[PDB]
Here is the input.
Amino acid sequence: MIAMVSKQPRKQRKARYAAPLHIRQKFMGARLSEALTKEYGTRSAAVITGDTVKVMRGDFKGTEGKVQSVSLMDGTITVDGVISTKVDGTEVPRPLNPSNVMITKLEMKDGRRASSIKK
Amino acid sequence: MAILRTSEIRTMTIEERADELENLNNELVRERALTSAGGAPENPGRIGEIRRTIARIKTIQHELNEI
Amino acid sequence: MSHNMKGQKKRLAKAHKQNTRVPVWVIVKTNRKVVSHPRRRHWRRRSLDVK
Amino acid sequence: MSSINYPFVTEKAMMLLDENKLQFIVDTRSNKKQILEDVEKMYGFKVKSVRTMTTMKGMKKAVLAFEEPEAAHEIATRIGLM
RNA sequence: UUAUGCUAUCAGGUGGAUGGCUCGGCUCAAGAGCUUAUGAAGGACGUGCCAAGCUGCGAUAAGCCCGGGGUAGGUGCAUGGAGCCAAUGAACCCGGGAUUUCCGAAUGGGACCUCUCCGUAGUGAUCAUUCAUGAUCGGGAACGCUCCGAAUUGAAACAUCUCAGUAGGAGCGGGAAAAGAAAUCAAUUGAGAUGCCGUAAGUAACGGCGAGUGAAACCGGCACAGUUCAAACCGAAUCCCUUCGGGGACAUGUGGUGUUGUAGGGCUGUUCAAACGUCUGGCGGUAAAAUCGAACUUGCCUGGAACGGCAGACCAUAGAGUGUGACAGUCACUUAGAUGUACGCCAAAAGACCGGAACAUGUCCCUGAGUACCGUGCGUUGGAUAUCGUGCGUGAAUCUGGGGGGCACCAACCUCCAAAACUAAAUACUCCUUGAGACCGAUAGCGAAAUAGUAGGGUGACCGAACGCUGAAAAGUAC
RNA sequence: UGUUCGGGUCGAAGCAGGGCUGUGAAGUCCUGUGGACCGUUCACAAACGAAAAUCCUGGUAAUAGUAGCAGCAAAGCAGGGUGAGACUCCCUGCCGCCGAAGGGGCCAGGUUUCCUCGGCAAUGUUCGUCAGCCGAGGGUUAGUCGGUCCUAAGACGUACCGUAAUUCGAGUACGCCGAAAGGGAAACAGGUUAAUAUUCCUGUACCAUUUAGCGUUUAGUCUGACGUCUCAGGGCAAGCCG
RNA sequence: AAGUCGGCUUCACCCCGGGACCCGUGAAAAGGACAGCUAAAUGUCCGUACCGAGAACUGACACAGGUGCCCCUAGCUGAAA
Ligand SMILES: [K+]
Ligand SMILES: [K+]
Ligand SMILES: [K+]
Ligand SMILES: [K+]
Ligand SMILES: [K+]
Ligand SMILES: [Mg+2]
Ligand SMILES: [Mg+2]
Ligand SMILES: [Mg+2]
Ligand SMILES: [Mg+2]
Ligand SMILES: [Mg+2]
Ligand SMILES: [Mg+2]
Ligand SMILES: [Mg+2]
Ligand SMILES: [Mg+2]
Ligand SMILES: [Mg+2]
Ligand SMILES: [Mg+2]
Ligand SMILES: [Mg+2]
Ligand SMILES: [Mg+2]
Here is the structure.
């Protein structure tokens, strides 16, 4: 969250850079699929470790996979199949920005998730 | 999970809390003595979690007017 | 064999243990961005302003 | 407030166990009387004497001689040194 | 094959300019504004599994507890290893607690000893009270008040003057402070507390009448607010502490009344009846983190990657902006617009309480003293024989009275009532919060894009740097 | 900056070199490099233009492979090791230095430089395998040694008084500090470690206070407690002789 | 491994006593002694490594200075350090 109090680039970027962890949770938002947006009433939700997303920007557009890991400080997620093979040849995950993906199936093992997504 | 939660400490008795505090102090003594030889701990996070559990026990004792 | 009190020797001990290199793991963690600190010194130079 | 931090386990500190002495790192704010009472309450062995020194790490080391033979070995086994 | 060299270009090295970028700086505006003996700020030392600096914290030591918000990750600057914590709801944020070493107002004593001595375990110093208890002390960016107080400089030298009541000093002190309800300003007859702003005006005034210095009132605004004592008359009719028994103050006067100028009040009589204010009350507003918030992530092309081009589809009380692999209203955070919020703060209806205002009568009573005034010296002032201060000396009056009206005195007229007290708002400032900007853009902008008052320098008072940038992703180069 | 009209990942700014135009300030284009921004109309602003200031900051030459690495203590050689590498590190021998200091002890000061292991980019005026350098780990033990106690010259605190005032000021009173070379309760020899040792260990001692018992004043004196020079006597560490 | 004896001298150290000099007079206080003996317990706190200098201090230095030559020092020659 950064209000229209400050339209200045420096203040916006300072707010994002020094965001608390509970504000960095909201930075993990991603677009919901049409079915999910219809059946939740909201347009977006935070990408969580476990839910299935489709990558829609970058070198891995079209891939569907489960979120392996989320970093709040980096603001990146790791998706099954989105990897960077290194000079060894071992496969390493390539971190993705959550705004570059779309949630197609939510992980709802947490009873608090529904109210977390809306309200 | 942790060694013992706030609910566990408040559930115990005065003697039980003192006994667990003494045992945690003993575990901290043993772990710090192991690191006195320079060698790495067998469980690096164990020392810090023992210290914070000791702090939590002391806080519960101070709330309960035992110390 | 100058004669220090407890506090003077404690301050000398702190000065001594401050005169250590940055740990190698800190250099790895920071990606070679933290490689030194301003409390490095040598005993045979401009002396401590501590004791 | 316990003055005893932990046994000092170095080569020289471990050489004390063969003379029934045991070296501890202690709080530097504490003195020999507090160290003796703390050790006697901590392990329940009578302490014959305390030798203490301050180091250039800012620590205080206490060497404890015990009255009962084998008490240093018993405490070192209880802690886990031996 | 001409070496040593010379000139131009090119390649490379060194170097770190230029460009581009910037979580920093600076300035302005709007807010908000005290804290500490219940031990502050500041400092020392310690505190991390591997931890040296900084930051945080205090032997419960990058932390402990409770409630709320948040929800799936977390483990500071600072993605390294290994672990630990977290759905028993962590991290994080808001509120409230606990712990909180030593020094420090530092306060049991002593400090070239951040420790040490006695331990009778600590109310250090100065004060108020009944002697239960209480106050003061240190800190705070500037602002505020009181007092002390230069010189450079200008005068083209220099002494009065100027610089300047500046610089600097000492004391006090709050969110503001000071001032403040006329012994006023006027002028022929008026106004009606104070502060601040505009103007008067570089005028009056001062001045080697040189250089220069320099008002106020009237008037226009901001904001508005009035009162309390001393005394007369009465005479303990009161106030405070309390273990609720009582105790303390107090006749050298607690309290009631009274509070002022075409005089007022008291005392005696008559009339009208009671306005302001204090307390309760919490309709309702303000109000924590925070919650919700429209509409594309569609085709082809280029590309490592579209937020781009060309087609296509939409939202707009939202086209401020920032992030996202290149230019984004529709991807994310937002925005416009609505919601919610513990403790608090303001707060209207309605109740409880001391009570207010006119007139008549007057050999009646009271109305602030080393004070007002004056002499003399000095400072200060625009204050000139006519500023204010204060050193010495002198020194009144009492309503048939006293002061002022820019030399003194006389008279007339006008005007007020000192020498006791308080008093919101309008004003100032910027540690701090938010916002903004024809500001700077890394030799700039703060000294510091902060492991920066740091490294380093000085015995000390003190002086004081340099250092920003891989990439979309470490894919940080296997063999 | 306002405003008009644009360019850019099919490659912006910048940079090196070049073509063209313009009297010129300059502009534009091309090639390469570069990887994300840049212009333009009409106006408006300014922290707006550098070759100079013994200018400032940074970087970097010539000097120059030059001076120095000599003068006050002219010091090394052989053989054998170690090592990738040896004038320079280790051992043995020979030859030398200081030997009333260059040895021994310790104050102030330093503050880990001490010891062990592992290193050699820098430091070391050469080299280096060495090191007071670099990294890692270890090391300082007290009733008897000092401090601590006492007071000295002399400070500081509180009070009083002064001062416009104070964190300022002399004096007085009461306190308190002020000596690791003054005064002073008491421990020695041996061993032990890699580095501590009157401190740890062995042996043999000693001092102080408190307590308990056994006994008590002589009380006010002495001691602590003292200059310079000179000399006798006695002893003794060291030294020397059979 | 011996480890037993004698002698000489003796500073620059200890004890003791004398003398001379002063227009110079050479600290104080704690503490101690003068009535203590026996037993038991207690003796906390701080320092302690190493250099102490032609390389560990100070002079920007591994500096021919200074701090310190501050206090000590074997044989011969020689009055002698
Ligand atoms: K002049
Ligand atoms: K002159
Ligand atoms: K995106
Ligand atoms: K963008
Ligand atoms: K020594
Ligand atoms: Mg104050
Ligand atoms: Mg002049
Ligand atoms: Mg007033
Ligand atoms: Mg003036
Ligand atoms: Mg928008
Ligand atoms: Mg700068
Ligand atoms: Mg600057
Ligand atoms: Mg130039
Ligand atoms: Mg010689
Ligand atoms: Mg070399
Ligand atoms: Mg000791
Ligand atoms: Mg003393």
